[PDB]
């Protein structure tokens, strides 16, 4: 089974540049290699095909090279579609192999996060449960680290977040946290805070409310 | 031009069986061998089956060997996927895709725009949807908790405002139900003066909510 290695995982690219991804291969495949774009929510589409055969309909900045165990795909002048993740994939072994995929995003200028906190509603307090959510928004580059401390207890497993797609305008990201404890713990402690680590920001901010 | 559309997607116990289509247009489909791949939420690409043009060659990856069945009606021009012996793993968004003549070694073009399987022991359910509550800018969302499965719509003011609103992956709890946050910043002296409504909407339980948050 051949094993597909991309690097690297995120390529930070300003509009206009240059983008070049590596694909590895365990083993030759002679120019039997494919690629493949894939912008959130939509399928994957073919952009090359035998290493450097561009697939119809593609733009010319596209362009494959490689043969046997090294492959790039070369995006020329990064236009605002082309920004997505890219797939290889080796097309010369019977178990099909695909690369685990590289994200190629617009390098802006550092922005810190705007952060918020928000208490858990009444109205959900009243069925036993309470979510507390902190909002980071509109930073880059993508890394941030959010804590959450319960009078100054750190809290770790209680918390799951997800971050948005790169936005079309501004080119950053933003963050959603939410810490879950239920009624009769939340109702046990008083200061609530989301403390924040980003690159854009001098020392880590903080958030938080007395319940 | 070749278009692939894949239907049967849905929600499924593990223990249950079900059946994606996938229908061809635009090519000589019996010309061609056939595949099935594969994407988890938030994950890569996983080859699945081969059918070569006439049926008489199958190949599955280990993954799904013994448990998913790949066939195709050459006078119909569609593709199946027959799905048993399910676990939670397969869940994933599964795509048809159009091969070349021999089916070995092929790469994959068109894709059909996939379809969303769901192998869980949860139950179809609508989401509770609570207030993430507020010279400057200001934070307002809803917080649409506890649905299953995806996905969910969520909107501000019926589309009227769109400006500064993000709207998060959902993240799947260890209840088996899925959480997801809809958020937009606005003029700080406008909490008190405008309204703010989300358009929640869960098709597949039928729930619609339209939710004012204020402070």
């Known amino acids: 089974e051949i094993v597909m290695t991309q690097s690297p995982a995120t390529l930070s690219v300003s509009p206009g540049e240059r983008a070049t991804l590596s694909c590895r291969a365990s083993?030759?495949?002679?120019?039997?290699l494919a690629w493949y774009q894939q912008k959130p929510g939509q399928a994957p589409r073919l952009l090359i095909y035998?290493?450097?055969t561009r697939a119809t309909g593609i733009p010319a900045r596209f362009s494959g090279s490689g043969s046997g165990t090294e492959f790039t795909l070369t995006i020329s002048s990064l236009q605002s579609e082309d920004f997505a993740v890219y797939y290889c994939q080796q097309c010369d072994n019977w178990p099909p192999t695909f690369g685990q995929g590289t994200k190629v995003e617009i390098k802006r200028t550092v922005a810190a996060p705007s952060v918020f906190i928000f208490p858990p509603s009444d109205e959900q307090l009243k069925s036993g449960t309470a979510s507390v959510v902190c909002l980071l928004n509109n930073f880059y580059p993508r890394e941030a680290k959010v804590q959450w401390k319960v009078d100054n207890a750190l809290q770790s497993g209680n918390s799951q977040e997800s971050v948005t797609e790169q936005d079309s305008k501004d080119s950053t990201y933003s963050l959603s946290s939410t810490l879950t404890l239920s009624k009769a713990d939340y109702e046990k402690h008083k200061v609530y805070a989301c403390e924040v680590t980003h690159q854009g920001l001098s020392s880590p901010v903080t958030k938080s409310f007395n319940r | 031009e070749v278009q692939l559309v894949e239907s049967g997607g849905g929600l499924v116990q593990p223990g249950g069986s079900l059946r994606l289509s996938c229908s061809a247009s635009g090519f000589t489909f019996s010309n061609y061998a056939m595949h099935w791949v594969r994407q988890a939420p938030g994950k890569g690409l996983e080859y699945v089956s081969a059918i070569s043009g006439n049926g008489g060659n199958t190949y599955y990856a280990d993954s799904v060997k013994g448990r998913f069945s790949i066939s195709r009606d050459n006078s119909k021009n569609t593709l199946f996927l027959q799905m048993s012996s399910l676990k939670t793993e397969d869940t994933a968004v599964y795509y048809c895709?159009?091969?070349?003549?021999?089916?070995?070694?092929?790469?994959?073009?068109?894709w059909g725009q996939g379809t969303l399987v769901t192998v869980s022991s949860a139950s179809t359910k609508g989401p509770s949807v609570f207030p993430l509550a507020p010279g400057g800018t200001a934070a307002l969302g809803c917080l649409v908790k506890d649905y299953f499965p995806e996905p969910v719509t969520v909107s501000w003011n019926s589309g009227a405002l769109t400006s500064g609103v993000h709207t998060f992956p959902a993240v799947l709890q260890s209840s088996g139900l899925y959480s997801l946050s809809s958020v937009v910043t606005v003029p700080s002296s406008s909490l008190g003066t405008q309204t703010y409504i989300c358009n929640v909407n869960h098709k597949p339980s039928n729930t619609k909510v339209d939710k004012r948050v204020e402070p």
């Open positions: 083993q030759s495949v002679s120019s039997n």
């Open positions: 035998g290493a450097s």
């Open positions: 895709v159009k091969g070349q003549f021999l089916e070995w070694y092929n790469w994959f073009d068109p």
